[PDB]
Amino acid sequence: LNLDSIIGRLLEVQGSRPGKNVQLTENEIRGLCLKSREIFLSQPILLELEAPLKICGDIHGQYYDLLRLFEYGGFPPESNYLFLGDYVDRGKQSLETICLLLAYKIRYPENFFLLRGNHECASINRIYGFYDECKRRYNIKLWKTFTDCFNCLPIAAIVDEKIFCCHGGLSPDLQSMEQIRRIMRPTDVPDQGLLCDLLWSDPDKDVQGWGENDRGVSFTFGAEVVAKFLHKHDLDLICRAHQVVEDGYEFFAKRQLVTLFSAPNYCGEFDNAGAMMSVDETLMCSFQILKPA
Amino acid sequence: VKKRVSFADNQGLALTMVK
Ligand SMILES: [Mn+2]
Ligand SMILES: [Mn+2]
Secondary structure (H helix, E strand, O other): OOHHHHHHHHHHHOOOOOOOOOOOOHHHHHHHHHHHHHHHHHOOOEEEEOOOEEEEOEOOOOHHHHHHHHHHHOOOOOOOEEEEOOOOOOOOOHHHHHHHHHHHHHHOOOOOEEEOOOOOOHHHHHHHOHHHHHHHHOOHHHHHHHHHHHHOOOOEEEEOOOEEEOOOOOOOOOOOOHHHHOOOOOOOOOOOOHHHHHHHOEEOOOOOOEEEOOOOOOEEEOHHHHHHHHHHOOOOEEEEOOOOOOOOEEEEOOOOEEEEEOOOOHHHOOOOOEOEEEEOOOOEEEEEEEOOO | OOOOOEEOOOOOOOOEEEO
């Protein structure tokens, strides 16, 4: 794999006027989808991680905001990074986004980690724009390779046995961490159950126990659900994304949970800001926020 | 042996970096 060349061409459009693309060779990308896929299957499905690192929420193809993130927090391995799914769809440059991440993953597999989102799934990114982007710029079979790569993504992580990181949130079927480790890869996302709720569920201010999710999929949960889950597993914080927030960060249940969103002006239909939780080795968490004019 | 999660805002330092 001629990796340093690929990463170089991906960062060549930094400073250019936004909207300019990066088109890699069809083979080069397919190499990323295989080399990264192997690294995923080697590392645990439940990532045991050590601070210090930076955690970023949804990107959703917004590639120039992602470049603004690294330009702010430092290009790897200057910092470590954890990403919470939703790399593709909605944005115009999903291919530039996902490739630069998968390249860094292969580049520094012990200091760069990508978690699965509800859009890293064929049935979803078929609808919202990653499929039309692959068919246009390349072909269909490349999308199927992407799918085979997405299936083997890791699901959740735990930063020093205290912070719990998943895309969506909690599941009623999750009572022990071994239920996560026993999940096999490759895997599609089933419409119901544990794996589905980890990428689709949402924190609800209005309900206390569990409730029906307006997405038509998974469940909501309340401030009571967060207090019991952190206590039973001896955890202090739950970190997730999956939902847009005004400041880029937004606490829940007396700072027990935080929602991260790293895409400013989410698909040109919001005034929102992008944020990024910088955690030093002592598990002290302060945010870095992106914002337009 | 086991560290704890402490916010910078909670511990007397600014929470937010603007750019
Ligand atoms: Mn999402
Ligand atoms: Mn999303």
